[PDB]
Design a protein around this motif. Structure first.
Motif, PDB file in Angstrom:
ATOM      1  N   UNK A 296       0.894  -1.144   0.000  1.00 27.24           N
ATOM      2  CA  UNK A 296       0.000   0.000   0.000  1.00 27.24           C
ATOM      3  C   UNK A 296       0.931   1.192   0.000  1.00 27.24           C
ATOM      4  N   UNK A 297       1.429   1.484   1.190  1.00 28.62           N
ATOM      5  CA  UNK A 297       2.366   2.546   1.449  1.00 28.62           C
ATOM      6  C   UNK A 297       2.629   3.388   0.234  1.00 28.62           C
ATOM      7  N   UNK A 298       3.305   2.806  -0.752  1.00 32.00           N
ATOM      8  CA  UNK A 298       3.623   3.479  -2.004  1.00 32.00           C
ATOM      9  C   UNK A 298       2.553   4.516  -2.188  1.00 32.00           C
ATOM     10  N   UNK A 299       1.335   4.059  -1.970  1.00 35.01           N
ATOM     11  CA  UNK A 299       0.183   4.913  -2.037  1.00 35.01           C
ATOM     12  C   UNK A 299       0.439   6.046  -1.049  1.00 35.01           C
ATOM     13  N   UNK A 300       0.020   5.820   0.197  1.00 31.01           N
ATOM     14  CA  UNK A 300       0.162   6.781   1.295  1.00 31.01           C
ATOM     15  C   UNK A 300       1.484   7.480   1.118  1.00 31.01           C
ATOM     16  N   UNK A 301       2.429   6.710   0.624  1.00 29.51           N
ATOM     17  CA  UNK A 301       3.744   7.196   0.358  1.00 29.51           C
ATOM     18  C   UNK A 301       3.597   8.347  -0.610  1.00 29.51           C
ATOM     19  N   UNK A 302       3.265   8.008  -1.847  1.00 26.53           N
ATOM     20  CA  UNK A 302       3.132   8.985  -2.917  1.00 26.53           C
ATOM     21  C   UNK A 302       2.416  10.301  -2.553  1.00 26.53           C
ATOM     22  N   UNK A 303       1.616  10.302  -1.486  1.00 25.22           N
ATOM     23  CA  UNK A 303       0.901  11.521  -1.087  1.00 25.22           C
ATOM     24  C   UNK A 303       1.867  12.649  -0.756  1.00 25.22           C
ATOM     25  N   UNK A 304       3.014  12.284  -0.189  1.00 29.30           N
ATOM     26  CA  UNK A 304       4.038  13.256   0.148  1.00 29.30           C
ATOM     27  C   UNK A 304       4.119  14.125  -1.072  1.00 29.30           C
ATOM     28  N   UNK A 305       4.398  13.474  -2.194  1.00 30.11           N
ATOM     29  CA  UNK A 305       4.497  14.165  -3.463  1.00 30.11           C
ATOM     30  C   UNK A 305       3.292  15.080  -3.571  1.00 30.11           C
ATOM     31  N   UNK A 306       2.133  14.553  -3.191  1.00 27.02           N
ATOM     32  CA  UNK A 306       0.937  15.362  -3.230  1.00 27.02           C
ATOM     33  C   UNK A 306       1.314  16.624  -2.489  1.00 27.02           C
ATOM     34  N   UNK A 307       1.463  16.506  -1.177  1.00 26.55           N
ATOM     35  CA  UNK A 307       1.828  17.671  -0.385  1.00 26.55           C
ATOM     36  C   UNK A 307       3.168  18.195  -0.831  1.00 26.55           C
ATOM     37  N   UNK A 308       4.221  17.545  -0.348  1.00 27.31           N
ATOM     38  CA  UNK A 308       5.572  17.926  -0.705  1.00 27.31           C
ATOM     39  C   UNK A 308       5.600  18.057  -2.228  1.00 27.31           C
ATOM     40  N   UNK A 309       5.578  19.308  -2.701  1.00 26.06           N
ATOM     41  CA  UNK A 309       5.585  19.709  -4.124  1.00 26.06           C
ATOM     42  C   UNK A 309       4.267  20.410  -4.439  1.00 26.06           C
ATOM     43  N   UNK A 310       3.514  20.745  -3.401  1.00 23.25           N
ATOM     44  CA  UNK A 310       2.257  21.417  -3.626  1.00 23.25           C
ATOM     45  C   UNK A 310       2.218  22.779  -3.033  1.00 23.25           C
ATOM     46  N   UNK A 311       2.947  22.907  -1.943  1.00 19.44           N
ATOM     47  CA  UNK A 311       3.100  24.174  -1.270  1.00 19.44           C
ATOM     48  C   UNK A 311       3.586  24.963  -2.473  1.00 19.44           C
ATOM     49  N   UNK A 312       4.272  24.216  -3.334  1.00 19.53           N
ATOM     50  CA  UNK A 312       4.823  24.711  -4.574  1.00 19.53           C
ATOM     51  C   UNK A 312       3.825  25.739  -5.078  1.00 19.53           C
ATOM     52  N   UNK A 313       2.555  25.352  -5.115  1.00 22.99           N
ATOM     53  CA  UNK A 313       1.517  26.265  -5.574  1.00 22.99           C
ATOM     54  C   UNK A 313       1.575  27.522  -4.727  1.00 22.99           C
ATOM     55  N   UNK A 314       1.056  27.373  -3.515  1.00 21.35           N
ATOM     56  CA  UNK A 314       0.976  28.436  -2.541  1.00 21.35           C
ATOM     57  C   UNK A 314       1.761  29.704  -2.952  1.00 21.35           C
ATOM     58  N   UNK A 315       2.719  30.141  -2.136  1.00 18.60           N
ATOM     59  CA  UNK A 315       3.497  31.356  -2.431  1.00 18.60           C
ATOM     60  C   UNK A 315       2.658  32.224  -3.314  1.00 18.60           C
TER      61      UNK A 315
END
Length: 432
Positions: A296-315
């Motif tokens: 599974x993890x890979x899943x839950x894992x991959x979410x980091x990418x979701x977040x980590x690389x999304x703040x990207x938007x913010x700013x």
RNA sequence: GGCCGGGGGAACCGGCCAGGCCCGGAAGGGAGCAACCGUGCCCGGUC
């Protein structure tokens, strides 16, 4: 054999037993199950190594039990260990096609072809096959069967010992009939070792026909040994991709597929063995994973990418001028997801920051206090059309109370948040 | 006035209803926001 190692997997999902030791064993343990199951070793050292390497150079990003990570890594390298990464391209370059099937001595020799062909018809295509082998008996014959018994004609020449012609012959046939895909197994007098000669044959065979896709095959029966065989050829033809006959047809496997890889070798399938379909595509993971199954993890894992690389938007967000773009105050709620899916709740919250990120912001020694209210902000969102969160500035008392109730939350809660959104930015957006 | 499409809408109460919201210990239900589905919705025809 290996299979029962894929257990070490959950055999590992045991808080009872400690750590590190747990590891190495497993290591060795898994490590064992391999060579024992054919598998070459010279290599191994390397894997087992690289494995180690990492450790003393990393750690699981916080907010996540090590034990797990270990795997990603383990898995990680299992990939590389085997058919690292290149997603084999087994489908049409154009049409029709030339499947030059070069085979050592028989073994899958013919067979194979079937499910192969077989496979592609239940893909919707004008197959077409030919008995491209005249040294060993049951050419068509044994094969012949299926051909019809699958609704797929084929063609050959009784007795008749002489490729080329026949081949050529065949070919253009279907072609003349304008079919879509041809498969043609071949081979010659002396193979293994006299490989030199086998290929030597395929030589003409190939360079006489002018095939697009060419493949050799082998049973794990030979295993890591095989290496060479194939090897000598990856040179003949690099486009030379292959598969390994019989999975359930040996006990050694590994080394087989192992060796392969370790040559830049190129696979595509594998097929457990018998039955007109047992053949399957192929992509390390596909399998590697497969011998760990629940990953599974890979899943839950991959979410980091979701977040980590999304703040990207913010700013600051959007670039340039004119035309329409993507999404944002949706991304808002988007943040949500990742996490919860990215492993359970809480443990993480604690383990990590609020929702802004880290700028000249407000609220105590640590950013948050959404603790519960969190899975509340969510409440709505999904309680609202897409567009809504794009124009987070059309929230009339009217359009929302429904979300309010529709989401089940008595008004207040919401209005009482709408701003923690339009102000976030406000401040947030405060770039000079 | 028979049919496929480009797009096609919060709240006059629709099909499946996630999420959650509520009654009951769990069962399982209750009303239902989006969400896809179509109503609808504007034009072209419909070998």
């Amino acid at each position: 054999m290996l299979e029962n190692i894929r257990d070490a997997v959950r055999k590992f999902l045991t808080g009872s037993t400690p750590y590190e030791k747990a590891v190495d064993e497993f290591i060795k343990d898994l490590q064992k199950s391999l060579i024992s199951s054919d598998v070459n070793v010279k290599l191994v050292f390397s894997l087992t190594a690289k494995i180690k390497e990492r450790l003393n150079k990393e750690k699981p990003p916080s907010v996540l039990e090590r034990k797990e990570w270990f795997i990603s890594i383990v898995y990680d390298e299992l990939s590389k260990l085997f058919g690292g990464d290149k997603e084999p391209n087994v489908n049409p370059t154009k049409l029709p096609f030339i499947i030059m099937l070069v085979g050592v001595q028989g073994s899958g020799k013919t067979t194979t072809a079937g499910k192969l062909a077989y496979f592609y018809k239940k893909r919707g295509y004008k197959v077409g096959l030919v008995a491209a082998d005249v040294y060993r008996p049951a050419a068509y014959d044994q094969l012949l069967q299926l051909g019809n018994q699958i609704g797929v004609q084929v063609y050959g020449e009784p007795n008749n010992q002489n490729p080329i012609e026949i081949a050529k012959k065949g070919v253009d046939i279907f072609v003349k009939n304008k079919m879509d895909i041809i498969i043609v197994d071949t081979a010659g007098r002396h193979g293994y070792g006299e490989e030199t000669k086998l290929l030597e044959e395929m030589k003409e065979m190939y360079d006489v026909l002018k095939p697009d896709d060419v493949i050799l095959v082998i049973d794990a029966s030979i295993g890591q040994k095989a290496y060479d065989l194939a090897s000598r050829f990856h040179q003949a033809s690099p486009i030379g991709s292959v598969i390994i006959t019989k999975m359930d047809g040996t006990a050694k496997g590994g080394g087989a597929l192992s060796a392969v890889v370790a040559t830049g070798a190129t696979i595509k399938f594998i097929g457990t063995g018998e039955k007109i379909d047992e053949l399957e595509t192929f992509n390390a993971k596909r399998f590697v994973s497969r011998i760990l199954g629940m990953g599974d993890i890979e899943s839950i894992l991959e979410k980091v990418k979701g977040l980590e690389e999304y703040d990207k938007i913010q700013k600051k967000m959007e670039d340039v001028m004119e035309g329409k773009g993507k999404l944002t105050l949706r991304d808002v709620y988007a943040q949500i997801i990742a996490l919860r899916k990215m492993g359970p709740l809480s443990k993480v919250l604690q383990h990590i920051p609020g929702l802004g990120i880290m700028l000249p912001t407000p609220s105590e020694d640590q950013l948050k206090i959404g603790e519960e209210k969190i899975r509340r902000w969510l409440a709505a969102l999904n309680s609202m059309t897409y567009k809504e969160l794009e124009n987070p500035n059309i929230i009339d008392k009217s359009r929302m109370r429904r979300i309010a109730e529709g989401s089940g939350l008595e008004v207040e809660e919401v209005r009482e948040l709408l701003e923690w959104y339009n102000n976030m930015n406000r401040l947030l957006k405060m770039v000079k």
